[PDB]
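Margin note: ligand = tolrestat.
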Amino acid sequence: SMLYKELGRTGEEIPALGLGTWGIGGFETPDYSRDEEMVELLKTAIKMGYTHIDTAEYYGGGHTEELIGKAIKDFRREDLFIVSKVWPTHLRRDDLLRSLENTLKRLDTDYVDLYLIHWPNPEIPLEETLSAMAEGVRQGLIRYIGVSNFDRRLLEEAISKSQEPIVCDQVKYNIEDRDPERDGLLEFCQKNGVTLVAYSPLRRTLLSEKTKRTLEEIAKNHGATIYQIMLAWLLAKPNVVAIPKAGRVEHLRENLKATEIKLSEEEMKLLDSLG
Ligand SMILES: COc1ccc2c(C(=S)N(C)CC(=O)O)cccc2c1C(F)(F)F
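Resulting structure:
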């Protein structure tokens, strides 16, 4: 069963595992060769409880949003939490609103639940970008806004330049990548009502031997895989939600089961000490 957590200070709970859609319908460019199969995979995921869907305008060169737009027609729009993002070349006002409009056209929906700046662009003033996002909110095209790949100092700057609340910061965070801890970003989010959304929450390969050995012992004690332990570790943290890459039905089932794991206080301290 899906774990839910409050988003920001919105009073709204969202699935604490998002459905990562990078690669569905292509990566950087559109891939049409598996459209029927991919729509079926998206519907299967949503039916399992993955109603929080993470995508972006540049996923599959726009085709990922198109495939999501077909899959979601089997469901009530208000039951889904759809996240999209704008590429850093589109952060000027007119370009952002065009990116938003085209995202809504490809999704064939009237609004996105959450819209994020994918990556900061120092050349474009944050106040302009955030003011354009607020126009989208005022028009009913966006429910919530957030940022992605903003370190602590830039998140603070964004908060100071945003009319609307910044409800999240989506950053890379996993058992080996501790930049959000070392930056004080996780602590800032926990103390300021911002959800930290961990992408690449699983490190599937190239782990250190100390990490592998520690995860293997805890996984054994819980009858789980090391990937389930990596996810449970993130989900145990206040204000942390995770976006595993969907991939396939086996991953969707395994990751959903990771919400059933209750790590002990000893296990958490041991995992915390790996980075
Ligand atoms: C459009 O191009 C992208 C976009 C995003 C990425 C990402 C990221 S950060 N994501 C897929 C997650 C996201 O965009 O939210 C990781 C690696 C290569 C990428 C690439 C690229 F493959 F080119 F390098």
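Residues 174 and 203 are 7 Å apart (CA to CA).
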